[PDB]
Each structure stands twice: as structure tokens, then as C-alpha cells.
Design a protein around this ligand. Structure first.
Ligand code: K
Ligand code: K
Ligand code: MG
Ligand code: MG
Ligand code: MG
Ligand code: MG
Ligand code: MG
Ligand code: MG
Ligand code: MG
Ligand code: MG
Ligand code: MG
Ligand code: MG
Ligand code: MG
Ligand code: MG
Ligand code: MG
Ligand code: MG
Ligand code: MG
Ligand code: MG
Ligand code: MG
Ligand code: MG
Ligand code: MG
Ligand code: MG
Ligand code: MG
Ligand code: MG
Ligand code: MG
Ligand code: MG
Ligand code: MG
Ligand code: MG
Ligand code: MG
Ligand code: MG
Ligand code: MG
Ligand code: MG
Ligand code: MG
Ligand code: MG
Ligand code: MG
Ligand code: MG
Ligand code: MG
Ligand code: NA
Ligand code: NA
Ligand code: NA
Ligand code: NA
Ligand code: NA
Ligand code: ZN
Lengths: 157, 276, 97, 199
RNA sequence: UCGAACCACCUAGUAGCUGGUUCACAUCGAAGUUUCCCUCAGGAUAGCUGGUGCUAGUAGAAGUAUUGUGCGGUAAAGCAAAUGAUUAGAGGGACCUAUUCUCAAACUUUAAAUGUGCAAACAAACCGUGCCUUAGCCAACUGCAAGGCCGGAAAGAAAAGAAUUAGAGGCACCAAGUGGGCCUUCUUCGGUAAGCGGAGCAGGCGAUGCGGAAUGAACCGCUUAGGGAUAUGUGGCGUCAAAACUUAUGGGCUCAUUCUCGAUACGUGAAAAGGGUUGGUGGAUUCCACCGGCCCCGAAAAUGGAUGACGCU
RNA sequence: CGGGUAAACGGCGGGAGUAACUAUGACUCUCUUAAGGUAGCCAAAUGCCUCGUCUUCCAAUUAGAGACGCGCAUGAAUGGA
RNA sequence: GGGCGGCAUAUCUGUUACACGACAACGCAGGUGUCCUAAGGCGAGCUCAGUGGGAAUCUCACGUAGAACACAAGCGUAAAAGCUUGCUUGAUUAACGAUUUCCAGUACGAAUCGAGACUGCGAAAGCAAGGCCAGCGAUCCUUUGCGAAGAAUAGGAAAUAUGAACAAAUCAUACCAGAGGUGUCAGAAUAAUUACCACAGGGAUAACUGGCUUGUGGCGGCCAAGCGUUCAUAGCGACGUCGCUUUUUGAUCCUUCGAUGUCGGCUCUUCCUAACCUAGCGCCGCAGAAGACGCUAAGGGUUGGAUUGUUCACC
RNA sequence: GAGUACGACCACACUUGAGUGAAAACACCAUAUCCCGUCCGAUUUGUGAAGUUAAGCACUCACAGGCUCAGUUAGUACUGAGGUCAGUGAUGACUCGGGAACCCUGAGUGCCGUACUCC
RNA sequence: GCGCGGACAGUAGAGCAGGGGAUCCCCGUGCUUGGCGAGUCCGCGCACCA
């Protein structure tokens, strides 16, 4: 019986086809701050500070930044509760997470609308529901039917 | 049996563009670009030295995701606006270009006249001032793929910048005149190489020879007038660093559209069918 | 496993307080004292009738032992102890080959 | 002797091929997968008949060999040996195990069989129009040698190729077929201009 | 009385084992799983349960969606892509070159469904280049980092299918029984197989009856204070037996002789193969081949017997 | 350490060739032990194969007796005959 | 079932495993208790395995890694993570910092992110507190290392503490960090036999009947290469394939362990048919006689003996 | 319209063949007294400028191979939910939903920054 | 673990494998580290609380 630290990671901790190589310069240049949402994704070409397989593909908040490492808080269910596990990884195994992108865009749009209404400018026209009825004026009208050729065709040989 | 079959190209992963062009060492570049993550992306500068066949390029560079940002540049092909007009790729030229880049960046940052460096070049080593009074501007040295041999001109640009007021962290171990036995530097040898005395000696020998030094011998460049020329060039640099050399048609080819290429192929097929 | 006879290592003490030369001696257990407190208690327990009064281990499984090195600064007389991995054959060699 | 094949008809295992994990496997009993004259050209035999599988089951290599021998012998005695080409399409790659309930019950190799699906082609015979009834009866007997239900059907393509039996003559006349052995590929108008590829 | 007599006593010896364990009804209500143990017929330990409550009662909610953003290599597919296995020809005995017959739990370029992290405005976030503080970063800074303070604005989250809630969140304390499970549905590993053995997900029985499948722990229906009325579910409506007192002003098909044709969801009587009747497809001049339906043959066991019985055409 | 002692406990071998037909093997080479089962006895209350093979006993004998011995695993006061 | 065997007892890859994580079998294929002063650390150069052309190993092109990285496997890696080489000891110390894996969210083992010291390499950015991921160990006991000197009028910021009337020197303890080991690897100090046997229990578990299964045994079909002078089928029937039966044995462990009397024979009754004889009938290679094969048929019948406990056997 | 240096993404950029290239660069190049390193100034290091676009490099071409994005394959394969569904069964269809891959075919063949320089 | 004897006799000789002449003679051959103290392997006889 075998349950190693990296047990069952043959396809998990592997590069995608024709995408091998050391991490990129953008990864080195990304600034990680305490409170940033990050995705924990293991980079198989580093093998230092690599997260345990459980935390691959989890998103959490940064609680700590060290010169070469990142502390992330990750939710982990166990029995009847979810713990807040603080994992330590090298910066190469985190990506700036986009989990709040739609919410930030929504807040930005609301500030912009507030400014426009304060200024008395023209608000954008409202989108309309596509589910409302109306007249349809067809261009081509065809008969939907089963023909002989369909049964003839879908037989092989 | 064939190695370069269809499967070979299907499985092939190209290197980075600058790796297969043989320009960028990406391990070294990644280590040079890296900072403490606790710095939160505070500015960091590489002093880039790239000596071409006829020119020396020295840049102060900042790494950005969109592409590197060049803050200041200096070129050894811009030195004759300061005197020196020959030997633009020797050690004295590398030193002068380094000093020019140092003075240019210190003037552009507004901290010139507050960090002067060594007014007279003595060739001795003084350890830089780093966080590791007011600290001087700090850049790290990027030699690229050049062999870091003792006496190489990349460290000549390094020394020129250091004498110009930079804080480029270095040890004297690769300056010309460093003896690896005693573990010590002969500052006079470095001084002589800085002011070009080796070039003057070789030129004197070549004159006594009676192809080398042809543009030298086309002018009346006596070996004894080299050192003063380099000193005066240093002074002219310290005077005015903004100085430089005094100062639509198209040769692009029309690529033919895909339909035109298809017409060409169809015509060739028609011709070969008729001919046979 | 081959080990150098002289080792260059951080000292620790205010005499040298830096990297320094260390002679290498392999640690070996000192003789069990007759008047060690546990030995006195054991001899008291063992006297009289009743046979053996403590366990005697028999089910030996280890084929090696951990190697402990005594490092001695030339400047001082202080000994530092370091632990190496288990190994069947430890030797202080000078050949460096 | 040999345990009956119906014991190994349930299939339901992950495939268990011969490998460096799976040692001790005897060879399949069928070793000739092409009967008649395989050398014969594609133009020679316009008619193609195949036996189609209607179940998802395992067919032992002994059965494939028996069916092959049956079809060969019938075509020989009721026709000639130079007028048909029959290829056996199913290859026995699944190793069967025997446990010679008990402890350590994992069995050792003792046979090999082909995992076969619904609508899979098991045999294919290439003949001329004149020896079609012999083809059909030979395939009926070979089919009798198989487990499960198989239906014999006429292939609308030309022989073992991928061209319709009717269109083949026109394209061949138009010089649009590369003839290489018992099958032909249609020349596609791509790549360099050769003396081939022109049409 | 003897592979260690008898009598009294230590001795009510110890027992993780077997047997027993005395009133009512009321509110709730399990577990056969985890980790450790000379541990496997037993314990500790967490979980499941009860009793206490504490706290500002709609709060820091969710076995569910949606939208946004991450994770994945199983099903499928592939061998005319790498690694392995593999049949045959063709072009330059073998080698090569283009493919072609077949394919893999310990192969894979690609790649689902179902899933699985995070977010979706009240201790938060946004705005001000607002102030203070710092032995933090930066060559310095009015830049970056961190903690605060002072304010402003907040569809309190528009519109575009643009959620819903029998939607008060948190926090403790003290304890019980369990720690032999078993069945079913999909997925399955070992086995010829098993009412066999082992797992994953989820519902069950165990602990639960009631209605129905004649009968059955587990199937179908429905789950339960004790009573009426009405209406259903599953299942039925020739008698047994409530219901077509054998309904229709519905269409077809089917004949069966000692095994009884059929009326058998689960499931509890079958195949390869073949032939009365009445359907279909494709040809030839009514017959030729082929394919269905129902029926028949293939179809042999021991007390007399079983669509539940009678019987029904 | 060195001697003695079996009517002390006990123990007591194989494979590889050979004689004018076939056999089996007096003979020989070898590997080998502390010694290699001697005199006897036997499918025996001891023989797996086995209901061994031959003779005799009967109409017919997995029984009985007499022989034979490649003796799974007979045998000498663990006393043999 | 137990025993014998094995280790599934501590533990690592791949698969089992069902695209998060988790997931069992005495499931599958393999590993582990070591080994390395370099096989650790760093810098610099270089490119590997294989091909092809050429010189009675050397050369020039190709070469996505098809090599190598101690050891099993997976993953990763090409101006390197491989090879060579230069100088090094970050394989040290590290204020009880935090964390992951196992998980009770305890230790142990292995990891990860750090802060300080002193350093190695490097021009520098940097990189290193072992060789990534398996390679290991509680209490008590034993044993080693650390608490250099020199200072203080007085226990302080800085002097190790104690042996309880107290002072010196021994000696013995103590506080921290390690070593010596428990492989049943959360850690007793352990040989057999019982048919002379005993107890508490167990149908949680074997042996006998019954039940499921039917591999094995038994009995049949289909197809048709052949055998039959000839001729596939009078008779039989390779190689394939589909059944049936519980008259064999195996597999299982559901019932029974506060007990279901256990082989054979004898005696006696009944049932089945896959028919030996007896009744009818087809068919043959059926001249007759004798027979073969099949069909309906289980109403009736189916012996006496030698050896053997036998059932079987065979005379 | 280009070039150089540093670059971001890392083939629409690669590979193989051919063709063209203004200026300035880039590079081939010439050479070893010195710094430095080699068996070998080959590589590397220093010093240089007589020549050349021959190669590198940049652009063009190929019914080129790969690669990228589409379509076709195909509502097919597979699959979440359901039935006292069909079938002896293997399996299959149906009902409410999700929905591929290869083969093949169409198009395309790098792009965005910082500085400096040439038309 | 504690002690002994030995790496043939020793304070470098002896046995003897291979060498010339008639079994004789002659060439050869042979535990570590230190200024007599401290380690490695065989045996013996003795100790056994992680
Ligand atoms: K199986
Ligand atoms: K009612
Ligand atoms: Mg993956
Ligand atoms: Mg008596
Ligand atoms: Mg009592
Ligand atoms: Mg009780
Ligand atoms: Mg309740
Ligand atoms: Mg598949
Ligand atoms: Mg409790
Ligand atoms: Mg119970
Ligand atoms: Mg009922
Ligand atoms: Mg009624
Ligand atoms: Mg009626
Ligand atoms: Mg009924
Ligand atoms: Mg004898
Ligand atoms: Mg005998
Ligand atoms: Mg006898
Ligand atoms: Mg007898
Ligand atoms: Mg006798
Ligand atoms: Mg005797
Ligand atoms: Mg899953
Ligand atoms: Mg998973
Ligand atoms: Mg701590
Ligand atoms: Mg630890
Ligand atoms: Mg580190
Ligand atoms: Mg390391
Ligand atoms: Mg290494
Ligand atoms: Mg490491
Ligand atoms: Mg390790
Ligand atoms: Mg234990
Ligand atoms: Mg007895
Ligand atoms: Mg008893
Ligand atoms: Mg039982
Ligand atoms: Mg019990
Ligand atoms: Mg009873
Ligand atoms: Mg009784
Ligand atoms: Mg009875
Ligand atoms: Na119920
Ligand atoms: Na009717
Ligand atoms: Na440090
Ligand atoms: Na210990
Ligand atoms: Na059988
Ligand atoms: Zn010291």
C-alpha cells in the first residue's frame, strides 16, 4: 500500500502537450499583495514550493507574502466543517485570480452611471427581453420532414 | 530512415523566439528580472551592455510585462561628438560610453551634481553603496551571452558607469589587471587600459612595422596623443551629456492575395495537363 | 560513506565566532557507570529472589546506527556534535577521490 | 481439455492485452488473416461481402480460425482459389484468464479472444459478380462457426476500397486513383505538382 | 470421586464471553464509518443522537440554480499523431517510403456529460492624487506597502429570462447507544459462476407498519395522533374478490394433444437452429429470394399440483 | 583442548559405462560419508505405487499359502532369524 | 475455517479509481530499512541517445531529448535539472516563527514558506541550510555535548542550579540538545505437545444433509472438413458453436455447534426416464438369421455367486 | 518603408527548398603586442577596417510539410434524469436535457511595446 | 560489551608452490597507525535493564 505525498499525480502534475518549459517572465513580474484572490495551480516544472495535490485548482485569499513565497488561505471541507488551511507555496504556483472580475466591472459601471446622472448626460438605452412576442416575417419557409434518403443514408456499407 | 517526418513536426515545440535567434539567455534573464515579492514590484534596473562589431550599446532598462522600458541609452558611435573618433569598440571606448550613460541617467533623474563619482579615473576598486546618506542610483549589470572574462569590455562599461556615479554592485575580479593568484587588483594596469595605453603601444609597433590601424594612419594619430584625447573626452562628457551627433519611400514587396495564388496554381496545373 | 578528516565550519563561540577548522572524531558511548542512579535502582531491584525484573530486548531489527561526529575547534576546546544518516561503513578518509 | 467459450462470453472486463505486465500468453490460434489470393489487384474483384456483428461479445481465436478454414475450403471446392480474397477483420488481443472464490484467485493466461462490438465487420470477401452465391454460402457456413448473431450484407463500395462500386470505374478512367496493392486512395489536389497528382 | 482424592477456607476468585434485568405516555432519535491499540467477539477517538443552554431574532445561511472566473483526462475518439501491440499488399531476403487490417487497466495528440474551487456591496468594496504614523520598499517622492483618522457616494444592487427558500446566524457545556451490517440502482475489480467475494455514488431495510405485486425484510405506491366524508396512488374491474351485473355504437393478431399456448415488471421456465398464419421489402411473370408479428418445434427428473385457483378462445 | 566408550542416544550413499543375439552387469571410472545396511528376512502386524508379478488354493480368490525383491520407509539386545 | 505458505503488519511509484479530493480485495506490475565528501552547494563552458558521409578513435551535417539524473515508477528538465570542469562544506547553526501531508485535524516520518548567525559560489542578479518527492522510532534507562576565561561589595542587562544546620573538594542529580530501539515499525521480555485432555463461547468459522453455482463430471443440439468401395449425414462427426441436468467433484459459507446420529449392507415402499427386456412403429449398408439407429411408451420386469467393509470394479 | 538593442505573447513566428535586398545598421570579415583562453585567436578574449552581401539576417514564392482559427464529421459517439419500457439476453430505442473527437475541407502564415538610428 | 591467543617462527628467518645438475644442495617467497602505545578479521572463555 502506497500513499505518498505525490501519489496519483501522473496526469495532474504534468505539462500540457507542446507547452513544456520553465515558468514565464510575466509570472516573475506579477505583484501579489495580501488580500489578493489567487488560483493555486501547481507548476510541474518547478518542484519547489509546490502545493499538495489537493490544492491544485482552488482559489483563496493571500494572507502572507515572503520574498519568494505566498501564503494562501484555502477552504477545505473535512467531515462536518470546512477549515481555512494556510498553505505555503512559491509564487510560481499562484495566478492572479479573475473570480471577482464581473463584480468589479459591475461596481465600475454603477459608479459611471452615478457620475453621468449627476452630470445630466444621456444614459445608455435599456436592453430589451428577447422573450417578448411579435410579428415574424419569414425569408425562406421549408418543409421539415423525414424522407426515404435519411434511412437509406444512415446505414453503412 | 527519416527523422524529419510529419510526426516530428507535429510533436515539435519551438523555443522562445529570442532563444532560437540566440540572443536571450532566459535563465539568466529570469534571475536578473526577479525581485523579492515583498518589494511589490518596486523599480529595478538592468544595465545592459551589448558590444556589436562596430558599436557599443549601453542601456538602463526596466522589465515590464508589455515589454522592457529603456530609460537612458548611450552608444559608442556617438563618442566623436566628445572628441574620441577612433577605436570606438576598445576598452577606452567602452569606459567612455559607460560614463556617458551614467551621466545621462543621473541628469535625467535630476540627481546629477549630487552624485559625481570619481572625477579622475584611477582604476582602483571602491565597493558600491547599497541598501543590502542618500543612496546612489543602482542598476545591475546584464552582460547577456558574453563571456565574463577578466579584462572584458563589458566590465569596462561597468567601470565607466561606476566612476560616473552609479551604484552597480560588482567586485574588481574581472577588471583588467586583477591577478587571480594574489587575489588583488593592479590599479595602474586598469588605468592604462582605461586611457588606451595598450592601443597606443600597438599603434606604435604597427607604425614601426612599415591593414591594421589604417584609419589611424590616414589621420596623423600619434601614439602619444591618445591618453590626452581620452581625458578630454571624459571632461567633455561631464560638461554636457545631452550632446550627440549633429543632424516617405517604401521598398516593401506586394504579397499576392490567396485568390491570386490559387489562380497561379490552377494555371500551372492547366499548363502541365496540356503539355502532357 | 567517506568523510573528511578536517572540516571547515562555523564555530559558534565568542573565541572564534566564525567559520573555523574542526578535527573529526566519531562519537562512541562511554562506559556505563556502576553508580548511575538508574544502575543503582536496577541493582537494588535485581537482588534477592524473583529472577529477571526488567525486560531484556531481543527483537533487533536495525542493521546500522546513526553516525555522530564530534567536531572540535582548534581555537577552543568546545566539542560540537552532528548527526549523519545511517550507513554500514563510515570512514574518515583523506584521499578525496 | 479446453473450458467452453461460453464461459468467457460475458466479457465485462477492462481489456487485458499481452504486455510486459501480462506474461505467459500463448499465440492466437488464427495467424492467417487474409485468405484466397491477397496479391490480387483492386480492379480484379468488384464485389465485396462482409459479415457484420450484431452483438457486443467476445469471439475466441479458435472460432476465427474455424470460420476461416470453413470459408476457404468451401470456396475451394465450389469455386477456385484464385477468384476470391477474404480478410479476417477481428484480431484477438484480449487475453483470457483461468483460475487453476479461493484466496489469491487472480488467474493466469490460457487463451486469447477478440472484443467485438455491434455493427463491427468480422469478415470481408472480395469476389467477382459470378461467384456471389459461393461467397454467400461460404459466409453462411463460416458464420455458423461464430457465437452470437451475424448478418451478411452486400458492400456497396468497390472491393476493399473506400469508393462506391459504381463510381470506381469512372474515377479510375479519369486517372484519379493511386493504385497501390489491394486498395486505392483518391488523389487529392494538394501538395507539390508531380507527374502524379496532376488530375 | 483420580492426566492430581476428599473436606473447610482464601472465594460472591476473574470472565473483552452466554443467559437474565420488574410501571405508564410525552418530546426527540441513531450506528455498523474514521484514527490508534498483541488490535479483529473488546476498547479509546471523531462522526451520527439527546439534554443543557449562551448570544443583539432574519446576522457570518444553503447536499439547488444562474452569471462570471479557475481546476480535470474518465466516457468517447486515435493508431492516416508519440510510446507499445498488429494483418497485408505497393512502390525504392532484408531494410526503408507512403498506408492499411486491428487495439491498450498500468498509451495518447483531442476531449464530453455528470462534477468540483472562488465571486456575486452593510466589520467588506469604491472615490479623495484628503490628513497622521512607520527602524517597511524604492536613488528619492507628493510614488508603492501597512495601520488608522477625516469626508463623499452608495439602482443596498438598474436593465438584459438576471434566482429561490416551511431562508434567525454564531458559540459552548455534559452525556448515551453504535464502531458484525445487509439490499437495490448506475459504475464496477477478482471469480466459469454463485442467494460469492471487494469498492464508488445515491436511496433503502435494519428501526416500519399501511396499500399493491397470490406469497416474499429490501420491489411498486405511500410512509404512520384517533375518527368521518370526499378524491386518488400503485394495482385492478368473469367468479373467488370491491369494481365494465362479461363496457364500447374500438382496430388488428393468435389454436395450443399428458411439457399443458398465453396472461411471469423486479423474478422466479431458456438458446443456437428451424416451420401454420398474416404483415413488409426488393426482382422476375401468380413465384424468387429476404425481413418482421403471433403460434409451433428445438424443450428430459425424480410425492400430486399450480398464469394464486376455477376457468377463459 | 586431548583420549575412551554404541547390549549410550542413535546412524548405516548416489551416477555412468561395460560380456560373440537381446538383456543384466561379475568388471571399470567417478562424486562422495563418521560409517555407507553385513548375516538374515519380506508386498511381513513394516511396500506408497498395489487388487505388485508367478505358482497354488476355487466354477469364479482385492482373501489365504509358497515363491520373487528396483525394500516409498526390512535388518541385527532401538535385538535379527 | 484453521494449519502450511505468504505479508496484503511500517512504507513508495503506476494501475485498480468511476476527468476535484477520498476510495477495498491474500487485486495487478514493481520498489523500500540502503547508497553518496560527491552522487551535496555554486559558477562557467558544453549537448545527449542515435543516424549519415568520410580517415591502414578522429572528423563534418542531422538529431525535441528517442539519453542522463545511485536505486522501483511517475513527473520534470536542453546555452539544464544532463556531461565536463573550478573551488567549496547551506549535509553547519538556525531565538520553542508559521504551514502541508497522515489526521482525531494528535504525535512520528517526510515536506513547504520564512526570520537571525556564520559561510560557499558568482562580475552580478542570485542560488544553497543535503542528494524534491520512500529510505525510519515514544516513556523509562544508559550515554555524550553545551553552561570558555575575565570581570561585579552583590545577584543586577550580564556569574548554570541542587544535595534542604552549612562550608570546601569530590561523587551524584537537574535543566537544554543529541546518540544507543523497539521491522508486531503509536514501541510486552517468550519453545513445543495433548488421541488423557478441560472451560467460556461461537453456526461471526470448518467437517455431514439441504440452498445458490456448474468450472469439473454427466447428457444433448446446430454447422459440416472428413470416415464410410463410391456417396457429409445407414451408421459418426473433426474444429467450431449453443444448451440441458444436479446421478461427480470443486467453489461458497446461507441454516444448524444449550447436538438434525455419520459409510456400506440388509429390509421395505414409492417416484423419474436420458428404454436393458417386454408391446407397437419407422429406418438401415434391411436377402434371411443376427443386429444398428430412432419414435410412442416407465404398465410389468431387471437374478445366483468368488475376492473386497466397501459404493465402484471384474470374474 | 526599414535597422539595431532590450523585450512581452511564444510556430499564423517552425522546417524544407528556391528568389530579391535602397540607406543606415547587422554580420561575415582582418589580425594577435598587450587583458584573457585554447591541442587548435576554430570557440573565446583583445586591437581593428582592407573587402563582401557569398552566407547569417530581413522580405517574396511553393495547388510544400507543420501550425492557428473555422466549417464538415454530427445532434453522430458518449452522457445527467425516467419507465411495472422492448428484448431470453447481450443490448436497444424512446422521454426531459447536455453534447464530442479523428479523417476531410475553407481561410490564414506572427503580433504588441521601450529607446535609438536610416529613408 | 571484557579479556585473551593468531593474522609458520620472529629481534624479517622457517616451511614450500615454480627454477640446474646427479631423494641431496642452490634461487625465491614472504595484519595496520604512531615514539615500544592506539585500530581491522578469526576464533575461545566470559556481560547482557533503553
Ligand atoms: K471478472
Ligand atoms: K372513499
Ligand atoms: Mg493533466
Ligand atoms: Mg473409585
Ligand atoms: Mg456477582
Ligand atoms: Mg440478553
Ligand atoms: Mg421523530
Ligand atoms: Mg476507450
Ligand atoms: Mg455521544
Ligand atoms: Mg441491530
Ligand atoms: Mg399484498
Ligand atoms: Mg364484485
Ligand atoms: Mg368483455
Ligand atoms: Mg392473479
Ligand atoms: Mg541387504
Ligand atoms: Mg518387501
Ligand atoms: Mg499384510
Ligand atoms: Mg495374498
Ligand atoms: Mg506371502
Ligand atoms: Mg549393534
Ligand atoms: Mg470523480
Ligand atoms: Mg478524483
Ligand atoms: Mg513552534
Ligand atoms: Mg518532523
Ligand atoms: Mg532555499
Ligand atoms: Mg539541497
Ligand atoms: Mg544531484
Ligand atoms: Mg531541496
Ligand atoms: Mg529522500
Ligand atoms: Mg504492534
Ligand atoms: Mg494412542
Ligand atoms: Mg464443554
Ligand atoms: Mg453462517
Ligand atoms: Mg456471537
Ligand atoms: Mg437443536
Ligand atoms: Mg436428537
Ligand atoms: Mg431425528
Ligand atoms: Na412504506
Ligand atoms: Na377487439
Ligand atoms: Na538566510
Ligand atoms: Na534512542
Ligand atoms: Na462438460
Ligand atoms: Zn572556535
Amino acid at each position: 500500500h502506497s500513499y505518498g505525498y505525490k501519489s496519483g499525480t501522473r496526469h495532474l502534475f504534468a505539462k500540457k502537450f507542446r507547452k513544456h518549459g520553465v515558468p514565464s517572465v510575466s509570472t516573475i513580474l506579477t505583484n501579489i499583495k495580501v488580500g489578493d484572490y489567487v488560483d493555486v495551480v501547481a507548476d510541474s516544472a518547478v518542484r519547489e514550493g509546490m502545493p499538495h495535490k489537493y490544492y491544485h485548482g482552488r482559489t483563496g485569499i493571500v494572507w502572507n507574502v515572503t520574498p519568494r513565497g505566498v501564503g494562501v488561505i484555502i477552504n477545505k471541507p473535512v467531515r462536518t466543517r470546512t477549515l481555512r488551511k494556510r498553505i505555503c507555496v512559491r509564487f510560481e504556483h499562484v495566478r492572479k485570480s479573475r473570480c471577482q472580475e464581473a463584480f468589479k466591472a459591475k461596481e465600475h459601471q454603477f459608479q459611471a452611471y452615478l457620475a453621468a446622472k449627476k452630470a445630466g448626460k444621456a444614459l445608455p438605452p435599456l436592453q430589451k427581453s428577447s422573450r417578448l412576442g411579435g410579428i415574424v416575417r419569414p425569408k425562406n419557409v421549408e418543409v421539415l420532414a423525414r424522407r426515404v434518403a435519411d434511412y437509406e443514408a444512415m446505414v453503412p456499407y | 530512415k527519416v527523422v524529419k517526418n510529419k510526426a516530428y513536426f507535429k510533436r515539435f515545440q519551438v523555443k522562445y523566439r529570442r532563444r532560437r535567434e540566440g540572443k536571450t539567455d532566459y535563465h539568466a534573464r529570469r534571475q536578473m528580472v526577479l525581485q523579492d515579492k515583498t518589494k511589490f514590484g518596486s523599480p529595478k534596473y538592468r544595465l545592459v551592455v551589448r558590444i556589436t562589431n562596430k558599436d557599443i550599446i549601453a542601456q538602463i532598462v526596466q522589465a515590464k510585462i508589455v515589454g522592457d522600458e529603456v530609460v537612458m541609452a548611450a552608444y559608442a558611435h556617438e563618442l566623436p561628438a566628445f572628441g574620441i573618433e577612433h577605436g570606438l569598440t576598445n576598452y577606452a571606448a567602452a569606459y567612455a560610453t559607460g560614463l556617458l550613460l551614467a551621466r545621462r541617467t543621473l541628469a535625467k533623474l535630476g540627481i546629477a551634481d549630487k552624485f559625481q563619482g570619481a572625477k579622475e579615473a584611477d582604476g582602483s576598486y571602491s565597493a558600491v553603496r547599497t541598501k543590502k546618506e542618500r543612496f546612489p542610483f543602482k542598476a545591475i549589470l546584464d552582460v547577456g551571452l558574453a563571456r565574463t572574462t577578466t579584462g572584458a569590455r563589458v566590465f569596462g562599461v561597468l567601470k565607466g558607469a561606476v566612476d560616473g556615479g552609479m551604484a552597480v554592485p560588482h567586485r574588481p575580479n574581472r577588471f583588467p589587471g586583477y591577478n587571480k593568484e594574489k587575489s588583488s587588483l593592479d590599479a595602474k594596469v586598469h588605468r592604462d587600459r582605461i586611457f588606451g595605453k595598450h592601443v597606443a603601444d600597438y599603434l606604435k609597433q604597427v607604425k614601426e612595422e612599415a591593414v591594421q590601424f589604417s584609419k589611424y594612419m590616414a589621420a596623423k594619430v600619434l601614439p602619444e596623443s591618445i591618453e590626452g584625447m581620452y581625458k578630454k573626452a571624459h571632461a567633455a562628457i561631464r560638461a554636457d551629456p545631452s550632446k550627440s551627433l549633429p543632424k516617405h519611400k517604401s521598398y516593401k514587396t506586394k504579397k499576392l492575395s490567396g485568390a491570386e495564388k490559387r489562380a497561379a496554381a490552377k494555371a500551372k496545373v492547366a499548363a502541365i495537363r496540356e503539355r502532357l | 560513506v567517506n568523510y573528511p578528516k578536517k572540516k571547515v565550519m562555523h564555530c559558534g563561540d565568542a573565541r572564534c565566532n566564525a567559520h573555523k577548522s574542526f578535527k573529526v572524531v566519531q562519537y562512541k558511548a562511554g562506559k556505563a557507570r556502576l553508580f548511575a542512579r538508574g544502575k543503582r535502582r536496577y541493582d537494588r531491584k535485581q537482588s534477592g529472589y524473583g529472577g529477571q525484573t526488567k525486560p531484556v530486548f531481543h527483537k533487533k531489527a536495525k542493521t546500522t546506527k546513526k553516525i555522530v561526529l564530534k567536531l572540535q575547534c582548534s581555537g577552543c576546546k568546545s566539542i560540537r556534535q552532528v548527526v549523519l544518516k545511517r550507513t554500514k561503513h563510515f570512514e574518515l578518509n583523506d584521499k578525496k577521490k | 481439455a479446453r473450458r467452453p467459450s461460453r464461459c468467457y462470453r460475458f466479457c465485462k472486463n477492462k481489456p487485458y492485452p499481452k504486455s510486459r505486465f501480462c506474461r505467459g500468453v500463448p499465440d492466437p490460434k488464427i495467424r492467417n488473416f487474409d485468405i484466397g489470393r491477397r496479391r490480387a489487384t483492386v480492379d480484379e474483384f468488384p464485389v465485396c461481402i462482409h459479415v457484420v456483428s450484431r452483438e457486443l461479445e467476445q469471439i475466441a481465436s479458435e472460432a476465427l480460425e474455424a470460420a476461416r478454414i470453413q470459408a476457404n475450403k468451401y470456396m475451394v471446392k465450389r469455386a477456385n482459389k484464385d477468384v476470391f480474397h477474404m480478410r479476417t477483420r477481428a484480431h484477438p488481443f484480449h487475453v483470457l484468464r483461468i483460475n487453476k472464490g479461493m484466496r489469491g484467485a487472480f488467474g493466469k493466461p490460457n487463451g486469447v479472444c477478440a472484443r467485438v462490438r455491434i455493427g463491427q465487420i468480422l469478415l470481408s470477401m472480395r469476389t467477382k459478380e459470378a461467384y456471389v452465391p459461393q461467397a454467400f454460402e461460404a459466409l453462411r457456413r463460416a458464420k455458423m462457426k461464430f457465437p452470437g448473431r451475424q448478418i451478411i450484407v452486400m458492400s456497396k463500395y468497390w472491393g476493399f476500397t473506400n469508393i462506391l462500386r459504381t463510381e470506381y470505374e469512372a474515377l479510375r478512367d479519369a486517372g484519379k486513383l493511386e493504385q497501390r496493392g489491394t486498395h486505392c486512395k483518391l488523389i487529392a489536389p494538394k501538395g507539390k505538382i508531380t507527374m502524379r497528382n496532376v488530375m
